[PDB]
Each structure stands twice: as structure tokens, then as C-alpha cells.
């Protein structure tokens, strides 16, 4: 007799995938108030951040100005690779010359990516991010492994992106110092629609963590974060840091000029797999768009950490490590409606909503 | 082999959370007609109300005028604490001097909250509501316990808010005379989005009740009530009273002036954790907004009790205590669409819809 | 350890409720083409209709003109009771004098309802419909029983409305000749919102049928039917006839004048529990609104039967009795989107969509 | 004790139906990059295509121009039958005279359909598509069988449409060379609403394949495909080719003139069961509408194959046959929201979104 959803193979539909909106954190016994929570966390095996946030390696998000401001806010930036090797390495130099700030840089896969990585390491980069659509591909695992054996002593090597336990386990055996999770949840991403491929971000973190935690390897949750609450959910699912693109793209520090359409303020934000970024045989997996202007980075980060601090008070988590042990309740479409404010016209501006 | 939603921990996603919209009451055998239902119910262990409704302790909802009108309608009001101690206590005096009416007042936690509580008790308040975001926090449980031991004989002490069985059990062992349930369902609340924390209100009541009912402690369902039907659902899930903010904020008795935008009538309604209420390092967990003007309180309460009376006739519940034994059917997104009127342009105004 | 949705009572949430939109009929082996399907079916134990459709007893739907046209189309009408007893009985006379046409009439419960029923029976009505919000109430069951014992020989007695197996079983033991199912699915109904009470219509039919079919008592599915496809679903769930309000209210034969707002054509349609119908202590359980004008009844019925005929060809059902043995597939929100036409601007008018 | 959704029959609701939007492909270990994927696949038992795509047999989609362009792009077209037999056969001749291109043609059931098929076979058609609403009907199975025995040696015979395992098994025993799947998922289809009949397309493919694969008979997934990602999902569910209507209707090669409403470009697209196509006793099962103009076919096909190539790289599938072994993760409504780009205003045009 058949599997309820079709066919005679119970593993054809392997699992049920949950995203951030499908779940809430459960309040627990607490001796923690928001002010006394400690928000520090491992970016990689060797690098601990004061604030568990990293800015995305995208040409509309992180250049030296964002990397500097992020590091000073206690987080880190990853410099995008959509520029010539000399300029990317130069921006690494601009950051390290602003007071020994932490900084990462993305590279792709191949000989040119190899030359890029070597120039970044010479410029003093702290973290190399091997930055690909599908980390489970053999080329990526080999590139991670070779950087690891070659520099490794010198620098941390992160690999992404993955959406499964087996892929995270493969990066760990390749020697990854951290594993970055997220195939298709990005706000500007179209992978799930163009290729039909991906995994909902909460389930993707839970699965990657089932592989990375036993190996002592930290998980970076990347993409799909829209609110401070999602950061707490990603960390409680077992991630150690979160990487943000659209939440940080509207900020003053993000590269790009202010757009003034309708006497309203916007900034361009685009996928690195979008047509405008890659530059007609290209098949793009991202879109180009715009986000509201959100003002200074510092005040965006204060709001995000403040929301995370509230979640730690609610779950009784004095540190990120205890937050990673929190429980979820799953919700329905109706519970999401309730979870957001409802049945009121919002008349005054809110900083975190 | 994994848990279907991710990882190897079957308790990581502890349960499935239902809100008011996810469920309907099942009709049952009835010898009860709406007119003959008895709507009385316990607010606390010592205090029984004629109508099982309480107005929220919010600066846009309950001041002496609302408390007076609520008590005369057979319910009760809880005076908000966003004012100086002398004025809050003075408003308690204004209410008690209108004919021995019942009244509650909110307090926070701490020495100033202690002084506030002592002035309220001296003014003759009947119920102290310890009014916090997270009742499971140690400070709140201690504050409940100390008020209980100190005044206790004199006054009833309610604690909130909670969303779990263990938190309700902790308030009961601290000596709470009632437990108030609701983390994040409020119409103006942003906790679930800012902190990612909460529990859907039907499941939250069912769980709190599993702890409070064996201890003979009544549950106040607080927040997320939009229609008279939700009140019946909350009571049938085991709550003894319901607390309303937005349903009562549009009324004449609510503090605040009438707003006339578009030749339409509104009243301001805002979270107590909203930016405008608390008064840039604040991290708000509510929004400021507006609700339609709904006219006299008395006629709003008549509609709410009338809807509750209909539910009692449908479920065969002569009293609230029997209603608390009713059954639910769970519905899908499509069943909600059907449950509301559909496929018609509503052309004339309805008092309860 | 708890029930997943809350508490320690596995029966508190008794079941999962499906509505028409949650399910599709499964195609089966067929030697039936739409043209050769036989659409006849039992209205009651004694009365078989050529077309398994009845018009609702509502003041915006069925008066003598609709009853006449319905009967001539092979269905039946139920004359509403929102008029004086002499006029209702007179309309029964107008119908019987148009060629021995079938006709029903609604009555409520009580002595006045008793006098009304006796005048209707004298006028020659074929079916008395005891027409109430909650058939499981003791007054309704007694009224059904007394009419049954008193007239019974003379006339058929239908009872409604019910949403459960136990309520349908109670009407059967009271002597009902048919059981009408539907609490809250009506397009103009607000019971599920005002009282929070009801059951999704597919599950409600399946349950009523589990009680009525073993007793040889036909089930009338009443309310929530928006498309011809829903009629086939209701019959396949085990109903023998369907009762329609909004699908027939836009027709020329429906009482009421044509409304011409925006150079568009509408007809008033309102719940019998709406404020305008019942005529400020009333608590209404319906709304007043308007529906598009749909032209002649005859061509609406042709479309509805044609859709039902297609379903019979698809399921291989030569008769309604075989259709009642068909199977459903349950769908998700995404399957409903797919089921309706999608991703196209509809530019030309369709008669059945 | 009852079945949770109603009644005492566990098979009344036979299964849970998934559509394309309910699922994503899971990334897997890969030694495949998009460029090196091989997209060839069986259309029928005897015919392998370079690109696993077929254009729909609809009067707004496939006439000789589309059939020619499709075949040159490595796919195939099926010429619609809403024209006189001499013109349809003539269009077959126009295609075969453009360099030995592959071509199919639709026929219905009956003697006229028989004469049509014989003229098509004489014109040199490669595939006859027996093109009906319900393939499980006895007339269709006999028509498939008779064509098979009569021509069979000469030509391939495909049968559709089906939505169940038993129906696909019946076509296989009738001698079908391929089975076409899809009852009601079409963008312009109204079967699920008019008749209430159908099955969600992912489950329908899984079930048909459970019957066709053991018999070595290829499955054509037909209808409901809106994005390149859906094609990959349909193939991974076990289909061998996909048939497209609306994705190809906006193209220059599609029959019909360009529409210029609002200084925007559209093309007419309509169901073959729509009122305008069939030409008031007709009961239509489709609508007439319009789709955006999408430019040259060639560049639409490049985008579709490019998306499919990405999915093959992500799942580690060097060929379509390995893709058919990929796994799904099921998603919720919230996961779909995430899967599409979200929380950004799309400002620049995307070729595949
Ligand atoms: C973050 C994403 C999705 C992104 C970013 C930049 C550029 C791209 C473009 C559009 C070039 N798309 C791909 O790169 N897609 C891809 C897919 C599968 C595979 Cl297997 C491969 C591949 O060749 N790998 C070695 C991973 C590439 C995607
Ligand atoms: C009803 C709500 C959500 C509300 C009402 C007024 C003010 C607030 C503000 C914005 C100050 N937010 C918090 O108070 N959040 C909070 C969270 C966790 C905790 Cl643990 C604590 C805490 O310190 N406690 C002792 C409960 C406080 C919230
Ligand atoms: C179809 C509906 C829902 C309808 C139609 C006309 C009028 C009404 C009004 C508004 C008067 N509402 C009720 O009648 N509600 C009701 C509820 C429970 C009960 Cl128990 C009773 C009752 O007294 N019964 C004897 C059934 C009545 C409802
Ligand atoms: C693709 C669809 C749904 C389509 C295409 C063209 C025309 C039609 C019209 C409107 C004529 N509708 C039907 O043909 N419906 C139908 C249903 C069941 C059946 Cl059993 C039969 C039937 O007689 N068969 C022999 C299959 C026909 C449908
Ligand atoms: O165009 C692309 N396609 C798919 N994912 C992308 C693309 N560009 C950036 N990303 C991912 O999306 C993340 C940002 O997602 P967001 O914060 O939800 O906007 C980045 O950190 C990358 O992991
Ligand atoms: O700003 C806040 N954040 C979260 N909850 C709040 C806030 N202010 C009031 N509440 C809660 O929300 C309830 C009112 O919810 P409502 O009736 O659904 O509008 C109150 O009774 C409080 O329990
Ligand atoms: O006002 C009312 N409240 C609830 N149900 C009603 C009311 N008036 C009519 N009904 C029911 O709704 C049905 C019509 O539903 P519709 O065809 O979905 O519009 C009627 O046949 C009655 O069973
Ligand atoms: O009018 C009709 N009713 C139902 N299905 C249709 C009708 N006309 C075409 N189809 C189907 O719909 C498919 C196209 O669906 P689409 O690509 O999703 O627009 C065709 O290949 C046929 O299988």
C-alpha cells in the first residue's frame, strides 16, 4: 500500500522542512535579564565574535566601510569578490589598518580563485570564505581542502553553502573551520524557483548541526533573516553566527548611493547571481532590487542584538551556548498572523518593526 | 534516522501550537438556550465575576472611567501603571468611590514596584496584577511570592505573563491567585518578531491549565482576542476569564481622544512596550497604532457576552465550568476562509462583525 | 507526556476538519460519460429529485417564483419563514397550483411555529423543514418528533442544522426523514466568528452520514457551496442533495430587485440571522450583502448539473449512489492555487467560473 | 473510533496530494556542474529527445511554426486538433519538410478521430497523442489500444490524461508508448473547480510512475509548470519529459497576434475546453485569457534548460535518469514565501523570474 504522498518509496520525500516563520522559541525558566545576557559566539573554531553577526559577501553589502563598522560593532564583514584581485586585497589592507580589526573575504573555486586567496592571505585576511552555490560539489570540497592544507595555519577557512547533514559532514572531513548554511533562503535568491532546489532554513541548520556539532565545527546561518527574532531562532537551532544581507543593505555603510524615488529613501540590493551583478546565455539565480534606507549600521546592530538579548532573557540563556539548547513550538499559518501585530493600522515608525 | 523536521532530537520541536483561528468549538447535545446560559466565572480564587471579561492594563485602554464601566458591566478593569504612583492610587480611589466597584491595578517588579503596590493596597485595590513580559523569570516569581506573603490576606495577586505549563506551575508554587497567559499573541505585540519567542494562544492556555486546574488556580487568557467567538474558545480551552485590549480600545470609555482621519473615527491604541509608551537604546516589543471607534463600552460588552451565550447554547454549557469541558475541531487555512463570511460584498454594518 | 497540541487530553481536539477546498475527487475507471450520468437522488426517504439541488429558505432566495422554477428544473425550493403565516401558506398554494410541483417550507420551533406548520400542511406542502441554528438542542428534537408523530403520514419532516455524528443520530431517533448538515459554512454566516462554533463541511457530512446512512436517512449538505465542483464533493462525501443560497441569489427568480452600482449588476443577499433580516440587544450570526447578478435560474442549474455530470464521468459514477462511494485526495494551500486557474489574466467571461 | 478527518472509512481520503510548490529538491553530493549535465530523455519508448520538453496541443500554443522551433531546440511540438483534418495533416507536412524534424499531433476519440489519425499517420507524424480529459474512461483505453494494434509499428501512441496509478496501469496494458499525467493542474484549467476532480501534480506523477516505470513506459508531466524549477521537480518525481502551455504561449512562435493593452505586450492563451475554443449548453472546463509576451522561443528554452542544468548540478545528476532518483523536502506555506525572493522590490527585469 502506498506512501500517503505518492509512490512506494517512503524516502522519496525525505523530510518536512521548517523555516523561521514556522517556529517560535519557547519561554523557559530564567535567571537572565536581557541586559545580563552574553552575546559572544564562535565564528570559526579559532575566532570568537562579541556579536554573533557577519555581513554578506555581496557587492551591495560589504566593502571596507561595512567591514570596518561591523568589526567595531563586535561582528565581522566578509568582503565581496565581484572586483579585481588587487582591489579586494587592498580593501583587506584598508580594514587591517583601522586598528587590527577582524575581516573576511570571499573567493570562488579555481586557479584564479587560488591567486585571489593567496593575495588575500598576504594582505592579512583572517577568514577565507569559499563562497559557492553548492558546497557539496566535488570542486568546492577540494578547494576547501587545499586551502586548508596550504595556508590553514595562517588563516581560517569557511565553506558554503550547504543545506544537508551529508554536505556539512563532507566539509568537516575536508577540514572546514566553519560551515555556512543556506541554499535558497536568500531574500534576493531565486534558486528554489529557477532550479527547484533547496531546504527550509530551520531544518537545514538542525541537520548541518547534527553533523558539525559532534566535530566541534561552528555553523553560520546565512540568508532568510528578516527580523531580530530570526537570528535568535537560527542560533537556538544550533547555528553559532548569522550572516545578513538585506538587513544590512539599507544602511549608510553599505556600498551604493541613496535612491530617492517618491520622496522615499532606498538602496540598491542585488543577488550576486543576478544579471546585473554577473556582468545572453547566463542563467541567473538572483534578482536585482532595492530596500528601504535604514540609517547608521550601529543603530541597526543595536536593535538586532537587543532583540537577541530579549530572546535570551525569555529562554533563560545566559550565553549563546545555552540558547543553542532552547526548544521550538511549531506554528500554523494562523499562528504567524497572530505572532506579527494584527488588526491595527501601524501609525508610528518602529525601529525594529 | 532523523526526526522528520531535522536533527536527532525528538524534543527540539516540543509541540505543535494552535491559535484561536486554528480551531472551532464542536456543537453538542444541549438543553441550554443562549438566554439561559450563566456567564459568571472566577477571576481569581476569591473573586467571581458576572461577566468573564477584564480590560487590559494599558494606557490606551484602562483608566478610572473604563474600570468603572467594566465593573458595572459585571467585569473588571486593570488600571495601567504608566503613571505616577499617586495618580494610579488616586484612580483606584475614584473607582472604589463609585459604589464599591471591583478594581485591579498593575505593578512591575522592584522596590518602586513595591512602593506602588503598597499604595494601591492602601487605596483599597482588590487585585494586584504583577504585569511582566516573562513571568517565568526569577525576579517575577519572587515578587509574586513576597506580595503574597505580605498582603495576601488583604488582596488577590495575579501573575503574568506565561506561555507554558512549567511557568504556570512555577507561579502556582509562588502562591499566585490566578495565572495570566499570553506571550506574543497581542494585536500590538511584536515579541514573536523581535525576539522570535512565544506560544500560540490556544496551546498556551491548554498547557497552563494542565498546571493550574489541578491546583484550583484560574487562568486569565490575555491577548489575541479579536471576536466574541475567540472568548468562547479561550474559555473552552480552560481559561476562566479573558483580558481584552484592542476590542475595548475603540470605546468611548477608553482614555484618549477621538481621531477623525478621512471623515472616519479612530482611537489611538499602542503597546506598553512601544516606543511612544516607554518614553535611542530602547528595544521595543510593541507598536503604536489606531483602531476603529466602536462606541459605548456597554454595547460592545453586550455583543461579546451575546456571542459567548450563543456558544454556550451550541455546546450545551449551562455555565462556564461546563464550557471548559467542550471539544475543538482543528481546521485548515481553507476552513478559516469558510468560517468567516465569504464570496459576498458586505454592504451593511454589523455590530459583532 | 503531553498531547502535541497541548494538555493531557487526547480528545480535547477531537478531530481534523476538512472543507470543500481541502479535497479533490479522484478520477476512477469509468464507463460513464457526462451525458449518460443519472443525476437523480433522494431529498428525503419518500421524495426523489431529478436534480439533487434545493434552494435555501432565505428571504433573498426562495419565494414562490424560485420554488416554481426550481421544481421545474427538477429540484426543489424551500420557502422562507420571514413572513406572516398566511403569506407563506399562500405561496405554497401558488406553487401547488402551477402543475403539482414539489415544494418545501421552513418553520422554527414553538407554538407559533406549530400553527405555521399546520397551515403549511393544509396548503399541501410536501416537506416541512425545521430550520434552526442548532438541531442538537432539545427543543428542536422535540419539535421534529412531534411533527413526525402528528402529520408524518401526510408530509416529510427534515431537521437541521447539524455538524456532528451524535446530532445526526439524535435527529434520526427523533424520526427525521432527512438531516440537514451545516453549522457555520454559509457564505453570509458569522457563527464561527461570533460564537467560535462549527465544523468544516466535508468532515461534517462524513460524520453525519456515518449516522444517517445506516438508518437509511438522506443527508442534505447545506452551505458553503461556491462552485459546481463542491456539489460533487458534497455528494461524494455521502450527502444526497445540496442546498444553495448564494449560488442562486443572483438569479432573476430570486426575490429582490436588481442593483445597479458602478454600471454593474447586483442582488441583495443576507443571512436570516443578519440584523436587517431579524427586524439594540440582538446578536446577529449573519451579514447583509450583495452578489453578482447571474441571470436566469435555468442556465445556472444547467451549469451546476453539467459540472456534476463531469464529475460523474471522471469518477465512473453512473448514478449519485455510486458517486457517494468515490474517494478524495487531500490537498495543501498550494494545491488549491493550482486547482483554480493560475498565472493568467482572465479576459473573457466564463459561465461556470 | 473515527478516522480523524471524518467517518469510519480510512480509505475515503485515500492520500495527501502534493503539488510543485509543496516540495523542493534536496542538494546532494555532486561531481556534476551545470555545463556537463546531459539533458536528453525518453519522450516515448522509441523516441529520445535532446531537451525533455514538449509544447502543448493547444490552438494558442502549437501550430507548425512552434513545432518546427521546438524540434530545432531539441524538443518537440504536438499540433493541436482544433482545426480541420486536412489542415492539421498539412501542418504535419510543413514540419516534416523542414529537415526531418520530429512532430506529434493530437486526436480525440471516435470515427472522426480515427480518420484524423489515419491522415496524420499518412502525413508522416511521429507521435499520435490521444488527447482527452479522462484517460481512464473506457472509450479512451479502447482508442489507444486500436491505434496501437493498427498503426503501432509505424508510429508512437501516447495516452492522456491520467492522475492515478490505476489509470496509468490501464493505459500501459492498452499498449501506450507513453502516459501523460495531469488532471486539473493546467494554468487555464477549471476542472478542479467545475467538477471538483483532480490530483496535485507531484503526487500524480509519483503514482503514475509507480505503474509506468516497472513497465518501461515513460511519463510526460503535463500542466502546472510555471518555472524552470518545476520541470526539474517533475523529472525528479519520475517523469521523463514535461509538456508546457503557458510558459510557451507568450512566445513569438506561438500562434496568435501580439496584444498591446496599456503599452504592454500580451498574447491570447486559452483552454481547449474554454468557451471560445469549443465554438448555450456547453459546460466549459477551461478559461480564455492572456499571458505576457516573452519573446523568441529559443531564449525561453535556453532559460528552462539552464534552470534544469542547475538542478542537475545541485543534485549530482549527470543525466535525467539519475535526476529521477533525487529526493524531495516537503515545505509549508512559509517555506514557499522564503523560496521565492522576498522583502525586496524587484526593480530590474529577470529572464527566468
Ligand atoms: C549563491 C548563488 C546561488 C549564486 C551566486 C553567484 C552566481 C550564481 C550562478 C548564477 C552563476 N549560479 C551558480 O553558480 N550555480 C551553480 C549551481 C550548481 C552548481 Cl554544482 C554550480 C557549480 O558549478 N559549482 C561548482 C558549485 C553552480 C549563483
Ligand atoms: C508585554 C511586553 C512584552 C512588554 C511590556 C512593556 C515593556 C516591554 C519591554 C520593551 C521593556 N521589554 C521587556 O520588558 N522585555 C523583557 C523580556 C524578557 C525578560 Cl526576562 C524581561 C525581564 O527583565 N523580566 C524580569 C521579565 C523583559 C515589554
Ligand atoms: C442559521 C443561523 C445561525 C441563524 C438563523 C436565524 C437567526 C439566528 C440567530 C441570530 C437568532 N441566532 C440563533 O438562533 N442562535 C442560536 C444559537 C444556539 C441555540 Cl441553542 C439557539 C436556540 O435557541 N435553539 C433552540 C437552537 C439559537 C441564527
Ligand atoms: C482537458 C480538458 C479537461 C478538456 C479539453 C477539451 C474539452 C473539454 C470539455 C469541456 C469538452 N470537457 C470534457 O471533455 N470533459 C469530460 C469529462 C469526463 C469525461 Cl469521462 C469525458 C469523456 O467523455 N471522455 C470520454 C473522457 C469528458 C475538456
Ligand atoms: O544571487 C544569489 N543567489 C542565491 N543566493 C544568493 C545570491 N546572492 C547572495 N546570496 C545569498 O543570500 C544571502 C543574503 O540573504 P538575505 O540576507 O536573506 O538577503 C547571502 O549571504 C548569500 O548567501
Ligand atoms: O507592547 C507590548 N508588547 C507585548 N504585549 C503587550 C504589549 N502591550 C500590551 N501587551 C499585551 O497585549 C494584551 C492586549 O492584546 P490585544 O487585546 O490582542 O490587543 C495586553 O493585555 C497585554 O497582555
Ligand atoms: O444568518 C445566518 N447565519 C448562519 N447561517 C445562515 C444564516 N442564514 C442562512 N444560513 C445558512 O446558510 C445557507 C446558505 O449558505 P450559502 O449557500 O453558502 O450562502 C442556508 O441554506 C442556511 O443553512
Ligand atoms: O481547457 C482545458 N481544460 C483543462 N485542461 C486543459 C485545457 N486545455 C489545455 N489543458 C491542459 O493544460 C495543459 C497546459 O497547462 P499549463 O502549461 O499549466 O498552462 C495542456 O497541456 C493540457 O494538458
The question of whether D189 is a catalytic residue gets the answer: yes
CB contact under 8 A, C346 and D287: yes
Strand partners, B158: B129, B178
Q: Looking at chain D, which subunits does it touch, using at least 3 CB pairs closer than 8 Å as the criterion? A: A, C
* A351/D138 Cα distance (integer angstroms): 66
- Bridge partners for C221 per DSSP: C181, C242
Phi, psi at residue C175, to the nearest 5°? 105, 20
Contact partners, residue D100, CB within 8 Å, separation at least 6: none
- Residue B113 CA to ligand 4 center (angstroms) comes to 74
Q: Which burial class, exposed, middle or buried, applies to A185 when counting CB atoms under 10 A from its CB (0-12, 13-18, 19+)?
A: buried
Report how far residue D301's alpha carbon sits from residue D351's, in angstroms, rounded to the nearest whole number: 11
All 3 cell numbers of residue B209? 491549565
Which residue in B14, A135, D7, B221 sits closest to C23, CA to CA? D7
Question: How many CB atoms neighbour CB C149 within 10 A?
Answer: 12
Query: How far is Cα B311 from Cα B307, in angstroms, rounded to an integer?
Result: 6
Which residue in the set A303, A307, A335 is minimally distant from B17, CB to CB?
Answer: A335
Centroid of chain to Cα B326? 20
From the list A24, A67, A78, A189, the catalytic residue is A189
Question: Cβ(A283)–Cβ(D352) under 8 Å?
Answer: yes
Instruction: For A293, name the nearest residue in chain D, comparing CA atoms only.
Output: D344
**Three-state DSSP state, D334:** helix
Q: Is A234 left (phi over 0), alpha (psi -120 to 50) or beta?
A: alpha
DSSP of C248-283:
HHTBTTSSSPEEEETTEEEEEEE-TTSHHHH-----
**Nearest alpha-carbon partner for D115 in D107, D127, D126, D105:** D107
Give the C-alpha separation, D162 to D13, whole Å: 19
What is the spatial distance between Cα A190 and Cα A184, in angstroms, rounded to a whole number?
Answer: 7
Taken as a whole, chain A contains a residue count of 353
Chain position carrying cell 493542474: D185
Task: Tell me whether residue B280 is exposed, middle or buried, using C-beta atoms within 10 angstroms of its C-beta: 0 to 12, 13 to 18, 19 or more.
Answer: exposed
Q: What is the DSSP string of A274-340?
A: SHHHH------SB-EEEEE--B-HHHHHHHHHHHHHHHHHHHT-SBHHHHTT--EEE--HHHHHHHS
Pairwise CB contact (< 8 Å): C284 & B328: no
Closest residue by Cα to residue C327 from D205, D10, D203: D10
Scanning every residue of chain C, which has its alpha carbon at the shortest distance from the alpha carbon of B327? C12
Whether residue C273 has its Cβ less than 6 Å from ligand 7: yes
Answer whether B127's CB lies under 8 Å from B104's CB.
yes
Q: Among A234, A305, A306, A325, which residue's Cα sits nearest to residue A49? A: A305
Residues paired with D189 in a beta bridge: D286
Burial A112-151 (b: 16+ CB within 10 A, else e): ebbebbbbbbebbbbbbbbbbbbbbbebbbebbbbbbeeb
CATH for A1-353 is 3.20.20.70
**Which residues of chain A from 5 to 34 reach within 8 Å of chain D, CB to CB?**
5-8, 11-22
Quote the ligand 5 centre to C47 CA distance (angstroms). 66
Which residue in A170, A178, A231 sits closest to A201, CA to CA? A231
Element (H or E) spanning B275, and its range?
Answer: helix B275-278
What SS3 class is residue A216? coil
Q: Given the C-alpha cell 507524424, which residue does it identify?
A: D125
- Count of CB atoms within 10 A of residue D46's CB? 12
Q: Give which of B191, C215, C51 is closest to A309, Cα–Cα.
A: B191
Q: Which residues contact B278 (CB under 8 A, 6 or more apart)?
A: B272, B284
Cα separation, D92 vs C347, in Å, equals 31
Is the Cβ–Cβ distance between C157 and C151 less than 8 Å?
Answer: yes
**DSSP 8-class letter at A63:** S
CA-nearest residue, atom 15 of ligand 1 = A133
CA–CA gap between residue B54 and residue B240 (Å, rounded): 11
Residue B19 to chain A, least CA–CA distance (Å): 6
Q: What is the resolution of this structure in A?
A: 2.0
Handedness of CA C296, C300, C305, C309 (dihedral sign): positive
CA distance B5 to chain C (A): 15
Instruction: Give the B window 313-332 contacts with C, CB below 8 Å.
Output: 313-316, 327-332
What cell was used for C275? Answer: 440584523
Which cell numbers in the block locate residue B307? 456571542
Q: How was this structure determined?
A: X-ray
| Strand C288-292, strand C41-42: pairing | unpaired
Alpha-carbon gap, residue D131 to D108, rounded angstroms: 6
- E-strand stretches of B116-215: 127-131, 156-162, 178-181
A344 is in an annotated binding site: no
Closest residue to atom 7 of ligand 3, CA basis = C273
Q: Which of A105, A188, A286 to mutate to test the pocket of ligand 5 (most atoms within 8 A of CB)?
A: A188
CA–CA distance, D169 with D176 (Å, rounded to integer): 10
Selection from A332, B335, B340 nearest residue C202 by Cα: B335
Q: For residues A304 and A296, is the Cβ–Cβ distance under 8 A?
A: no
Residue B284, C-alpha cell as written in the block: 521595543
Phi, psi angle pair for C201, to nearest 5°: -65, -35
Place of cell 432573476: C252
Tell me the three cell numbers of residue C186: 454559509
Compute CA distances B35 → B277, B294, B319, whole Å.
41, 24, 12
Q: Specify the 3-state DSSP secondary structure of A49.
A: strand
- Give the orientation angle of helix C297-315 with respect to helix C64-72, to 10 degrees: 40
Q: How far is the CA of C194 from the centre of ligand 3 (A)?
A: 12
CA distance D293 to chain C (A): 12
> What gap in Å lies between CA C139 and CA A295, rounded to an integer?
67
Please judge whether B291 and A333 are an interchain contact, meaning their C-beta atoms are less than 8 angstroms apart. Answer: no
- Do the beta carbons of residue A226 and residue A249 sit within 8 Å? no
Q: Which three three-digit cell numbers place residue D216? A: 518501461
B201 contacts B182 by C-beta, under 8 angstroms: yes
**Catalytic residue selected from D119, D189, D211, D248:** D189
C30 lines ligand 4 (CB under 6 A): yes
Chain A residue whose CA is closest to B23 = A334
Q: What is the DSSP string of A111-178?
A: HHHHHHHHHHHHTT-SEEEEE-S-TTBHHHHHHHHHHHHHTTTSSEEEEEEE-SHHHHHHHHHHT-SE
State the Cα–Cα distance between residues B276 and B270, nearest whole angstrom.
Answer: 8
Number of residues that make up chain C: 353
C333 in B contact zone (CB under 8 Å)? yes
Task: Tell me the backbone φ, ψ of residue B147, rounded to 5 degrees.
Answer: -65, -45
Residue numbers followed by a gap, chain B, C–N over 2.5 Å: 279
For the record, the C-alpha cell of A91 comes out as 580593501
Q: Which residues are bridge partners to A197 per DSSP?
A: D25
The residues near C100 (Cβ < 8 Å, ≥ 6 apart) are none
Q: Is A187 marked as binding a ligand?
A: yes
- d(CA B252, CA B258) in angstroms, rounded, equals 8
Strands C288-292 and C264-270: antiparallel
* Closest chain A C-alpha to D211 CA, distance in angstroms: 9
Which of helix, strand or coil describes residue C288? strand
Helix or strand or coil: residue B224? coil
8 A C-beta contact, residue D106 and residue D79: yes
Say which DSSP state C286 is in: B
Strand A76-79 with A104-107, pairing: parallel
On whether the CB atoms of residues A85 and A114 are closer than 8 A, the answer is no
Residue in A closest to D33 by C-alpha: A137
Nine-digit cell string for B229: 467567538
Q: Is the CB of B313 under 6 A from ligand 3?
A: yes
- Residues pairing with C140 in the sheet: none
Q: How far is CA D352 from CA A280, A283, C67, D38, D333, in A?
A: 12, 7, 55, 20, 22
Distance C237 CA to ligand 8 centre (A): 28
Give the burial class of B215: count Cβ atoms within 10 A of its Cβ; 0-12 exposed, 13-18 middle, 19 or more buried: middle
Which alpha helices (DSSP H) does chain D contain, by range?
A: 64-72, 85-96, 111-122, 138-150, 165-174, 191-194, 201-212, 228-236, 246-249, 275-278, 297-315, 320-323, 333-339
Closest C-alpha to ligand 2, atom 19: A313
Q: How far apart are CA A60 and CA A267, in angstroms?
A: 9
How many whole angstroms separate alpha carbon B190 and alpha carbon B187?
Answer: 9
The DSSP 8-state label assigned to residue A215 in this structure reads: G
D41 CB contacts (<8 Å, ≥6 apart)? D48, D49, D52, D218, D235, D240, D241, D320, D321
Cα–Cα distance between C243 and C80 in angstroms, integer? 13
Q: Where are the domains of chain A?
A: 1-353
Q: Which of residues 176-215 of B touch C (CB under 8 A)?
A: 202-207, 209-210
Amino acid at each position: 500500500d502506498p506512501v500517503p504522498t505518492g509512490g512506494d518509496d517512503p524516502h522519496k520525500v525525505a523530510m518536512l522542512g521548517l523555516t523561521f516563520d514556522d517556529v517560535l522559541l519557547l519561554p523557559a525558566a530564567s535567571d537572565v535579564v536581557p541586559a545580563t545576557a552574553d552575546t559572544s559566539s564562535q565564528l570559526t573554531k579559532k575566532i570568537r565574535l562579541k556579536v554573533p553577526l557577519v555581513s554578506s559577501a555581496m557587492d551591495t553589502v560589504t566593502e571596507s566601510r561595512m567591514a570596518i563598522a561591523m568589526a567595531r560593532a563586535g561582528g565581522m564583514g566578509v568582503l565581496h569578490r565581484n572586483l579585481p584581485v588587487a582591489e579586494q586585497a587592498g580593501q583587506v589592507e584598508m580594514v587591517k589598518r583601522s586598528g587590527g580589526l577582524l575581516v573576511g573575504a570571499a573567493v570562488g573555486v579555481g586557479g584564479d580563485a587560488w591567486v585571489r586567496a593567496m593575495m588575500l592571505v598576504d594582505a592579512g585576511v583572517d577568514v577565507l570564505v569559499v563562497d559557492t552555490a553548492h558546497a557539496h560539489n566535488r570542486l568546492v570540497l577540494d578547494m576547501v581542502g587545499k586551502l586548508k592544507s596550504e595556508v590553514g595555519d595562517r588563516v581560517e577557512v569557511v565553506g558554503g553553502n550547504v543545506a544537508t547533514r551529508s554536505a556539512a559532514a563532507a566539509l568537516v572531513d575536508a577540514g572546514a573551520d566553519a560551515v555556512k548554511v543556506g541554499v535558497g533562503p536568500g531574500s534576493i535568491c531565486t534558486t528554489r524557483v529557477v532550479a527547484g532546489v533547496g531546504a527550509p532554513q530551520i531544518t537545514a541548520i538542525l541537520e548541518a548541526v547534527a553533523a558539525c556539532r559532534p566535530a566541534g565545527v561552528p555553523v553560520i546561518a546565512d540568508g532568510g533573516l528578516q527580523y531580530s527574532g530570526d537570528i535568535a531562532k537560527a542560533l537556538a537551532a544550533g547555528a553559532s553566527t548569522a550572516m545578513l544581507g538585506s538587513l544590512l543593505a539599507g544602511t549608510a555603510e553599505a556600498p551604493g548611493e541613496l535612491i530617492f524615488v517618491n520622496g522615499k529613501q532606498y538602496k540598491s540590493y542585488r543577488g550576486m547571481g543576478s544579471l546585473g551583478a554577473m556582468r545572453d546565455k547566463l542563467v541567473p539565480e538572483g534578482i536585482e532590487g532595492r530596500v528601504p534606507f535604514r540609517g547608521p549600521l550601529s543603530s541597526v546592530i543595536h536593535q538586532l542584538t537587543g532583540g537577541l538579548r530579549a530572546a535570551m532573557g525569555y529562554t533563560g540563556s545566559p550565553t549563546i551556548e545555552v540558547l543553542q539548547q532552547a526548544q521550538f513550538v511549531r506554528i500554523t499559518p494562523a499562528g504567524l498572523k497572530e505572532s506579527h501585530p494584527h488588526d491595527v493600522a501601524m501609525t508610528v515608525e518602529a525601529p525594529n518593526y
